[PDB]
Amino acid sequence: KTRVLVVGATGYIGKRIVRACLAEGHETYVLQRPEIGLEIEKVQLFLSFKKLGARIVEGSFSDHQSLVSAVKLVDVVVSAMSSHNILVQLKLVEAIKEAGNVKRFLPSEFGMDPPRMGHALPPGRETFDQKMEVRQAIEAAGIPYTYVVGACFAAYFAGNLSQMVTLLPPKEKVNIYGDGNVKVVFADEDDIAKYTAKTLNDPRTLNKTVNIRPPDNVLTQLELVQIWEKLTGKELEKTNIAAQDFLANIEQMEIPHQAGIGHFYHIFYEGCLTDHEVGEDEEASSLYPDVKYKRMDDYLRMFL
Amino acid sequence: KTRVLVVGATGYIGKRIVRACLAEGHETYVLQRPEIGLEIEKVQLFLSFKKLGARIVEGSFSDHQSLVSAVKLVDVVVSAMSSHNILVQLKLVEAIKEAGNVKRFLPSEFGMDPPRMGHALPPGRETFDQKMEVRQAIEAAGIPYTYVVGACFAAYFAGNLSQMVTLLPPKEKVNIYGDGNVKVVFADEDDIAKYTAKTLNDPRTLNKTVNIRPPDNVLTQLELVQIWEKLTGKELEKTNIAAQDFLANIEQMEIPHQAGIGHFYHIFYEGCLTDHEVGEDEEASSLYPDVKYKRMDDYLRMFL
């Protein structure tokens, strides 16, 4: 019981959500679009889904009632859209509204909490406003909701030691942002997918914002580096980077990777993932203690 | 106890060859070049090799010594490059020649036997030129070899029912090439990978061409369609497409769509994978009957 439709199942986090829902025990439906047809590694991905028991539902964002058709089948929709890919979610929102059977929607939120980013930095701000547009469509339709926020994906922030331009630990030299004493929240993407699978039929998170702040994984950038140093037995030579040398030459001197560099600043310089605090009734590791979340020392071991 | 380096592991057949080596029991080294510490799905491929026991080897084609080093850790280097990808092999073959320690090399050919392609014309021809340009460079260095040819990947030619323009079964209509009585070879790509992992170490094939031609998988597109409509229960509205109409106006289409049109013609009209016969000393399924390779029935069943 609890039939779940996943839209965005070809995305980085959406792979993981489908497999987390299958293993949690939901009836997991996966929307198939004119996806591939065209691209090989997304058919095989979908084939791998059905070999585990996912049910394929064809639909298009161009075809409004194909979307109503997907969502008639389930109790809960989960979106993981990783062009304007966040704002296409509004085509789905009114599909859910026309259908009316939906007991919950979880929009594509799996990073910084958007209503806390009112004075974010252009162009980075576009993300949070586009996501806030979708919330409003939801709440204006009276669609019950859950928003999963709070944690940097370990692959994009923890395995590269928070460097940019690489997704792997460095070989001798590492940049520290500011003094390196600002605390960031890291979470293995698998554990975000599992927390997502557990919260969607949980009565205690209906119409609420769930934070993913696993206590062992609340780290300053400098502690994270030290973890890597201890696994390896080698210090890295470290250059501290002052705030204004961090946004140096953003101007339009990089393609809108400018959005990423700005999100990085809010996290690593201002500490927006940690500048407030959350209760046990709204944080994921307290709500689902059965989930043994991968600590960042274990994440990093995968790279030795 | 056979050591194998796999170059091109991020590629389509590359992935499985890495995985088929490990399942057969060789010490499987995988070249990791700078290109991959980018694009998550390549780092997360590579660390899922690590979880399966592969050993990561760093190097660059632009650093001839780094390939020299890798090629010394190993008894056999396999290449599987799915443009520039075919003749960059040449600067590996020099790293293997200057090496001297490598008992077998397998260049990237898992398509059609190139010295039979004296008849195609540009632009389809070029990859055959490049493929034998790297063979002439292998036989010239005297590096012992094995070329592995003669099968359509089931994902590209079977599961789409040999329609171009998609990789999924057609919902109502199909195009039959010719009267559709030209029979070609279909191999599950997993099967092409495990064959290569077993002929790697085997004295029978050293310095010979081994053909992947499963007996029960030599079919024309017509019965392969009928296979699908057995499994499905519906008849597909066939439309035969005559050889001249199929290449009508090819010179006025984009010059990779030419290549694909030429490619499909050699297979489904000229019979390039059938125009020939092969015995048992030379045909993978007979040298390795411990494979219960997948027939296009069971393969196409994955889609229903």
Residue numbers in the entry:
A (entry chain B), B (entry chain C): 9 to 90, 96 to 317
What does the paper say about this structure?
Pinoresinol/lariciresinol reductase (PLR), an NADPH-dependent reductase, converts pinoresinol to lariciresinol and subsequently to secoisolariciresinol. Here, we present crystal structures of IiPLR1 from Isatis indigotica and pinoresinol reductases (PrRs) AtPrR1 and AtPrR2 from Arabidopsis thaliana, in the apo, substrate-bound and product-bound states. The crystal structures were captured in the apo, substrate-bound and/or product-bound forms. We found that, for all 16 structures we solved, each enzyme adopts a similar head-to-tail dimer conformation, strongly suggesting that each PLR/PrR functions as a homodimer, consistent with the literature that TpPLR1 exists as a dimeric entity in solution. Each structure contains a head-to-tail homodimer, and the catalytic pocket comprises structural elements from both monomers. β4 loop covers the top of the pocket, and residue 98 from the loop governs catalytic specificity.
